[PDB]
Design a protein around this nucleic acid. Structure first.
Length: 92
DNA sequence: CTAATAACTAGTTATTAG
DNA sequence: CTAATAACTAGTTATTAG
């Protein structure tokens, strides 16, 4: 109704932490590039729950984990062991 | 024409406010 | 839902700079 229509504001996600925890196992079962909406269907299979903002989440994942990369528009990849931040040793 | 700033187009859901 | 502000990918068009 009234003239005070402009109300909102925002910050990066907190529900998005559900994507971090599921996406690590979702991505470790692959070693190849995937689109946001294909990785969404894969995380929906992995977790059984809804998918927060893919662009903000996947860049939050990248800045925390250089093993994750962005080859194209909404297209992402995870290289090898995500534990490579402290797995300085060879593979088993 | 190559480079940077600015406005606009096409894509994607969140979280705050009510 | 209504309403905006938010964080991010990539390209066309236009002005300023060279």
């Amino acid at each position: 109704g009234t003239t005070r229509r402009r109300r909102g504001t925002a910050r990066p996600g907190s529900k998005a932490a559900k994507l971090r925890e599921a996406a690590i196992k979702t991505l470790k079962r692959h070693n190849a590039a995937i689109k946001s909406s294909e990785l969404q269907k894969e995380i929906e299979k992995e977790s059984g729950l809804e998918i927060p903002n893919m662009t903000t989440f996947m860049q939050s994942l990248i800045k925390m984990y250089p093993e994750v990369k962005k080859p194209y528009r909404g297209q992402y990849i995870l290289e090898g062991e995500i534990e490579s931040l402290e797995h300085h040793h060879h593979h088993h």
